[PDB]
Amino acid sequence: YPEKKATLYFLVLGFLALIVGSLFGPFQALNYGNVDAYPLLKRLLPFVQSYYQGLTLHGVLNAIVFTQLFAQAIMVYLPARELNMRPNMGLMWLSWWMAFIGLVVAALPLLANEATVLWTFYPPLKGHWAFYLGASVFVLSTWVSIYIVLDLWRRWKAANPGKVTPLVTYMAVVFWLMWFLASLGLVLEAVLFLLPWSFGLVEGVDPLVARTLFWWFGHPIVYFWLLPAYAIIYTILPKQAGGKLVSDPMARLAFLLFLLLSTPVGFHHQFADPGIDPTWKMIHSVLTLFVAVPSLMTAFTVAASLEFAGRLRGGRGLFGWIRALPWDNPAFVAPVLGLLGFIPGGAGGIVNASFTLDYVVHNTAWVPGHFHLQVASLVTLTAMGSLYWLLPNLTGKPISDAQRRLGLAVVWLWFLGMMIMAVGLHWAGLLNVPRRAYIAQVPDAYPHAAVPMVFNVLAGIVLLVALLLFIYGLFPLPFAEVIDRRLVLAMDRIGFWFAVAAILVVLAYGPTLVQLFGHLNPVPGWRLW
Amino acid sequence: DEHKAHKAILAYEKGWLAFSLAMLFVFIALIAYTLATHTAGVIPAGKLERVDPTTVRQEGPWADPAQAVVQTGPNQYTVYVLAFAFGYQPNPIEVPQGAEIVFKITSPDVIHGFHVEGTNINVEVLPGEVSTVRYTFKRPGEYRIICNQYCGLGHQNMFGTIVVKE
Amino acid sequence: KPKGALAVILVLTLTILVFWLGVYAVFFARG
Ligand code: HAS
Ligand code: HEM
Ligand SMILES: CCCCCCCC/C=C/CCCCCCCC(=O)OC[C@H](O)CO
Ligand SMILES: CCCCCCCC/C=C\CCCCCCCC(=O)OC[C@H](O)CO
Numbered sequence: 027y028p029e030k031k032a033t034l035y036f037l038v039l040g041f042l043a044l045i046v047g048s049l050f051g052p053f054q055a056l057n058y059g060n061v062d063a064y065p066l067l068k069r070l071l072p073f074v075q076s077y078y079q080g081l082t083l084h085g086v087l088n089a090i091v092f093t094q095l096f097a098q099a100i101m102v103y104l105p106a107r108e109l110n111m112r113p114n115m116g117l118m119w120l121s122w123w124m125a126f127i128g129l130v131v132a133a134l135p136l137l138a139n140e141a142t143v144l145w146t147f148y149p150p151l152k153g154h155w156a157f158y159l160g161a162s163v164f165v166l167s168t169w170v171s172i173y174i175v176l177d178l179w180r181r182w183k184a185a186n187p188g189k190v191t192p193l194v195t196y197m198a199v200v201f202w203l204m205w206f207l208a209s210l211g212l213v214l215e216a217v218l219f220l221l222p223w224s225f226g227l228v229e230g231v232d233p234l235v236a237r238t239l240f241w242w243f244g245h246p247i248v249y250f251w252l253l254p255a256y257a258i259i260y261t262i263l264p265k266q267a268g269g270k271l272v273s274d275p276m277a278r279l280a281f282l283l284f285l286l287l288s289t290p291v292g293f294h295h296q297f298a299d300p301g302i303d304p305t306w307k308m309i310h311s312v313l314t315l316f317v318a319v320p321s322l323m324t325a326f327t328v329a330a331s332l333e334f335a336g337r338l339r340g341g342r343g344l345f346g347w348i349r350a351l352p353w354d355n356p357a358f359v360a361p362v363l364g365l366l367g368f369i370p371g372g373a374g375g376i377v378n379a380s381f382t383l384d385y386v387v388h389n390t391a392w393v394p395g396h397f398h399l400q401v402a403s404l405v406t407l408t409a410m411g412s413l414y415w416l417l418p419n420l421t422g423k424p425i426s427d428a429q430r431r432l433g434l435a436v437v438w439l440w441f442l443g444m445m446i447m448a449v450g451l452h453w454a455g456l457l458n459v460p461r462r463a464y465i466a467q468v469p470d471a472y473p474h475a476a477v478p479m480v481f482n483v484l485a486g487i488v489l490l491v492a493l494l495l496f497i498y499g500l501f502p503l504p505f506a507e508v509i510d511r512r513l514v515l516a517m518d519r520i521g522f523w524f525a526v527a528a529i530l531v532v533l534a535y536g537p538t539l540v541q542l543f544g545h546l547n548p549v550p551g552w553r554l555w
Numbered sequence: 556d557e558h559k560a561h562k563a564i565l566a567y568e569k570g571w572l573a574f575s576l577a578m579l580f581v582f583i584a585l586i587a588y589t590l591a592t593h594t595a596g597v598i599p600a601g602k603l604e605r606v607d608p609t610t611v612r613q614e615g616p617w618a619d620p621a622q623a624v625v626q627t628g629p630n631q632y633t634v635y636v637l638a639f640a641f642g643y644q645p646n647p648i649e650v651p652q653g654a655e656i657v658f659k660i661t662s663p664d665v666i667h668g669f670h671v672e673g674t675n676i677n678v679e680v681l682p683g684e685v686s687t688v689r690y691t692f693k694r695p696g697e698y699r700i701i702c703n704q705y706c707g708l709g710h711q712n713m714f715g716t717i718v719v720k721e
Numbered sequence: 722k723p724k725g726a727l728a729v730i731l732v733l734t735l736t737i738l739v740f741w742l743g744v745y746a747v748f749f750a751r752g
C-alpha cells in the first residue's frame with residue numbers, strides 16, 4: 027500500500043506545522059493574561075519582529091496548514107480503505123508536493139516579516155506576492171484531492187451500479203464537493219485581486235469586495251476543518267468506545283446538510299461591514315442558524331452511540347454508562363473531550379450568528395474563546411488521538427503503554443488548558459477586550475479584566491506543558507459497525523444535491539456581488555508592520 | 556435488544572430534532588424583534604457611499620475635525636469620524652445626551668474597528684467606504700473608543716474618546 | 722429510552738439558552 031506513505035507524509039507535515047504554530051500559543055495566552063513574554067521569545071527566535079508576525083504564523087500554520095493537511099490525509103485515505111481501492115498515486119504525490127511547495131514559498135515572506143497580515147490578509151494591508159502565491163498553490167492542492175476522491179467514487183460506482191454509496195465515501199464525496207464550491211471564493215479573490223495587486227499590476231483593491239469573496243471561502247473552511255473529525259467520530263469512535271454507530275442514515279443526513287448549508291452563510295462574518303444590505307445579513311443569519319442543525323443532530327446521534335457502548339460494557343444508571351467507557355484509550359478520550367468543549371463552543375457560535383447579538387462580541391476576546399473550543403480543541407484533539415490508531419495502521423509500528431499514558435496526559439492537559447483559556451477569553455470579551463491585540467503592552471488599559479486575565483495566564487502555562495509533552499512524545503482501520511432505505515436513496519442522488527448547493531450560493535452571493543462589482547473602489551495598499 | 560434500542564433512539568432523536576428546530580426558530584423571532592427597535596440603529600446602513608482615502612484628509616467633511624459634529628435635525632447630530640493609524644478625529648467627539656447620533660466613519664489607510672465601550676456601537680471602517688451607524692446616548696460622561704481590527708503595530712494603543720454632555 | 726443521550730442534549734440546551742439569553746440581556750443593557 028503506497029497510499030499509506032502518501033498519507034503519512036500529509037499527517038507528518040501537518041503536525042510539524044502544528045508544533046511550530048503552537049509555539050506562539052503560550053506567549054499569546056500570557057499576553058491576554060497581561061503578562062509580556064516577547065523579550066524572552068525574541069531571544070529564542072530572533073527572526074520574530076513582533077507579536078503580530080507571531081500572530082500571523084500561529085494562525086496560518088495552525089488553522090490553514092495543519093487542518094488542511096489533516097483533511098487531505100483523512101478524507102482521502104479513509105474512503106480508499108473503506109472501498110479497498112487504490113488512489114491515483116501520481117495525483118496523490120502531486121497534491122502533496124503542491125502543499126509542500128506552496129508552504130515553503132509562503133513561509134519565506136512570512137519568516138522575513140514581509141507578510142504580517144493575519145490569516146485573513148485583509149486589504150489594504152499589503153503582503154508580499156510570495157505569501158499570496160504560496161497560499162494559493164497551497165489551497166489549490168485540495169482541487170487534486172477532490173478529483174482523486176471523485177475518481178475513486180466513480181470507479182467503484184462503475185463496478186457497482188444500483189448500490190448505494192458506502193458511508194465514509196459518501197461522507198468524503200459530499201465533503202469534497204462542498205469544498206470545491208467554498209474554495210471558489212478564494213480562487214476568485216486571489217486571481218481577480220490579490221495576485222494582480224501584489225505583483226504590481228493594479229494599484230488598488232476594493233476592501234469590501236475582498237472581504238466578501240474572502241468570507242465566501244472563509245466560513246466553509248471551518249467545516250472543512252471539522253468534517254474530518256466528524257467522519258472519525260461517526261465511523262471510528264463508536265468502535266473505540268466499545269459500541270456501534272447508531273444510524274447510518276442520520277450521519278449521511280448530517281453530512282448532506284453541511285453540503286447544502288456550508289457556503290451561503292458568509293455575511294455572518296460581515297454583520298459589521300458597511301455596504302451590505304441588512305436584509306441580506308438577516309438572510310445569512312437564518313441560513314447560519316440552519317447550519318447548526320447538522321451539529322445538533324450530530325450531538326444526539328453521537329451521544330446515543332456512546333451511551334450504547336456504555337451499556338454494552340455494563341454501565342447502568344443515568345451516568346453509569348459514562349464510567350463504563352474506555353477512559354484508558356487516548357484514541358477515545360481525545361474526541362470525547364473535544365465533544366464536551368464543543369458544547370459551549372457551539373453555544374457561542376449560535377450567539378455569534380444572531381445578527382444583532384454579534385455587535386456585543388464582534389472582534390473581542392470572545393471570538394477566539396469560541397473558536398479555540400472548535401478547532402483548537404475538538405478538531406486538534408481528534409487529530410491527536412487518531413495518532414494512536416492511525417500511526418500503527420500506517421507505519422507498522424506499535425504504541426507502548428508508556429506512550430499510551432503520555433498520550434492520555436497530553437490530551438487531558440490540552441483539553442483542560444483549552445477550557446481554562448476559553449473561560450478567560452469569553453469573559454475578557456464580555457468586558458470589551460479586543461481580539462488580535464498585544465494588550466500586555468498597554469498594561470493599564472483593561473483593569474476590569476484582572477480576573478479573566480488570571481485564567482489566561484494559567485492556561486498559557488498548562489498549554490505550554492502540554493505542547494512540550496506533545497513534542498517530547500512525537501519524537502485494519504477500526505471502522506465501527508452500524509446497529510429507511512428510501513431516504514438513503516434520496517441522499518445518494520449526488521449531482522442533484524450538488525446542483526442545489528450551487529444554486530444556493532448563486533442565490534446568497536449573486537445579488538450582493540453583482541451590486542459590488544458594479545461600483546468597485548480600489549484603494550492603495552499599506553505595510554504598517 | 557438491538558432492534559429495540561435502534562427504534563427508541565430514533566424515536567427520541569426525531570423529538571430532539573423537533574425541539575431544537577423550534578429553539579432556533581424562537582431565536583429567529585427574537586432577532587426579528589431586535590430589528591424593529593431603536594437598538595438596531597447600530598447595524599450599518601446597507602448603502603454604498605464611496606470616497607477617496609487619499610484626499611479625505613484634505614477636502615470634504617472629514618478635513619476639519621472641529622467642525623465634524625453637525626446638527627442635522629431638531630434632535631439629531633451627524634459626526635464625521637476619521638479612523639486612522641493610529642487614532643481618531645475628532646478627539647474627543649462631543650455629543651449631547653438623548654440626541655440621535657449618526658456616525659459616518661471612514662479610513663484613509665487601512666481597515667479599523669470602531670467599538671464604543673459600553674455600547675452596541677461596533678462597526679468596521681473601510682478605506683473607500685463610509686460606515687453609517689446610529690445610536691442615542693442614554694448616560695452622560697466619557698466613553699472610550701477601541702480599535703478592534705488589526706491595523707498594524709500601533710493597533711493595541713489605538714483609542715479614542717466620546718464625551719456625552721449632561 | 723436513551724436516557725444518557727437525553728442528559729447530554731439537556732446540558733447542551735441549557736448551555737445554549739444560558740449563553741443566548743445571557744448575551745441578549747447584555748445587548749439590551751448596552752442598547
Ligand atoms: C472547527 C472550527 C469552527 C466551527 C465548527 C465553528 C462553528 C460555528 N461557528 Fe465559528 N463563528 C460563527 C458561527 C458559528 C456557528 C453558528 C457554529 C455552529 O456550527 C455550531 C454548531 C454546534 C453545536 C450546536 C454544538 C453541538 C455539540 C456537540 C455535537 C457535542 C455534544 C457532546 C457529545 C455527543 C459528547 C457527550 C459525551 C459524554 C461522554 C458526556 C460566526 C458568526 O455567526 C462567527 C463570527 C463572529 C465574529 O464577530 O467574528 C464565527 C467565527 C469563528 C472564527 C473566527 C474567524 C476569524 O478569524 O475572524 C473561527 C476560526 C471559527 C471557527 C469555527 N466555528 N468561528
Ligand atoms: C498551544 C495552544 C494554543 C494557545 C495557548 C493558543 C492561544 C491563542 C490565543 C491566546 C489567541 C488570541 C491571540 C489574539 O487574538 O491576539 C490565539 C489566536 C488564534 N489561534 Fe490559537 N492557541 C493554541 C493553539 C491553536 C490551534 C491548534 C489553532 C487551530 C487549530 C489555533 C487557532 C487560532 C487562530 C486562527 C488564531 C487567530 C489569529 C488571528 O486573529 O488572525 N490555536 N490562540
Ligand atoms: C501540569 C502542570 C500544569 C500547570 C500547573 C502549574 C501552575 C503554575 C504555578 C502556580 C503556582 C503559583 C504561582 C504563582 C507565583 C508566581 C506569580 C508571580 O509572582 O507573578 C509573576 C509576575 O506577576 C508575571 O511577570
Ligand atoms: C474552568 C474550566 C475547568 C473546568 C474543568 C471541568 C470540565 C469537565 C472535566 C472533565 C469531564 C470528564 C467527564 C468524565 C470523567 C471520566 C473519568 C471516569 O469516569 O473514569 C472512569 C473510571 O476510572 C473507570 O474507567
Ligand SMILES: CCCCCCCC/C=C\CCCCCCCC(=O)OC[C@H](O)CO
Binds near residue numbers: 366369370732
Ligand atoms: C459538559 C460541559 C458543559 C458545558 C457547560 C459549561 C459552560 C458554563 C456556561 C455559562 C457560565 C456563565 C455563568 C453565568 C453568568 C453569571 C452572570 C453574573 O454573575 O453577572 C455579572 C455582572 O453582569 C457583571 O459583573
Ligand SMILES: CCCCCCCC/C=C\CCCCCCCC(=O)OC[C@H](O)CO
Binds near residue numbers: 480
Ligand atoms: C493550578 C491551580 C489553579 C490556580 C493556581 C494557579 C493560577 C495562577 C497562575 C498565574 C497567576 C500569576 C500571574 C497573575 C498576574 C496576571 C493577572 C493579573 O492579576 O493582572 C491584572 C493586573 O492589573 C496586572 O498588572
Ligand SMILES: CCCCCCCC/C=C\CCCCCCCC(=O)OC[C@H](O)CO
Binds near residue numbers: 566569571730734735
Ligand atoms: C424554557 C424552555 C424549556 C427549556 C428546558 C429544556 C427542555 C429539554 C430540551 C429538550 C427535550 C428533548 C426531548 C424531546 C423528545 C420528546 C420525547 C419523544 O420523542 O417521545 C416519543 C417517545 O417514543 C415516547 O412516546
Ligand SMILES: CCCCCCCC/C=C\CCCCCCCC(=O)OC[C@H](O)CO
Binds near residue numbers: 452456457694750
Ligand atoms: C464564565 C463567564 C463569566 C462572565 C461574567 C459576566 C460579566 C458581564 C459584564 C458586563 C456585560 C454588560 C455591559 C454593560 C455596559 C454598561 C456600561 C456602563 O454603563 O458604563 C460605561 C460608561 O462609559 C460610564 O460612563
Ligand SMILES: CCCCCCCC/C=C\CCCCCCCC(=O)OC[C@H](O)CO
Binds near residue numbers: 449452453744747
Ligand atoms: C467549560 C467552560 C467553557 C467556558 C464557557 C464560557 C463562559 C461564558 C458563558 C456565558 C455567558 C453568558 C452571558 C453573560 C450574562 C450575564 C449578564 C447578565 O445577566 O445581563 C444583564 C446585565 O445587567 C448585563 O450587564
Ligand SMILES: CCCCCCCC/C=C\CCCCCCCC(=O)OC[C@H](O)CO
Binds near residue numbers: 581585749
Ligand atoms: C408554546 C409557546 C412557545 C412560544 C415561545 C416564545 C418565546 C418568547 C418570544 C418573544 C418575546 C419577545 C419580547 C422581547 C423582549 C425584549 C425587550 C427588551 O429587552 O427591552 C426593550 C428595549 O429597550 C426596546 O424598547
Ligand code: CUA
Binds near residue numbers: 713
Ligand atoms: Cu486601528 Cu487596530
Ligand SMILES: [O-][O-]
Binds near residue numbers: 244245248
Ligand atoms: O466560521 O464560523
Ligand SMILES: [Cu+2]
Binds near residue numbers: 244246248
Ligand atoms: Cu463562519
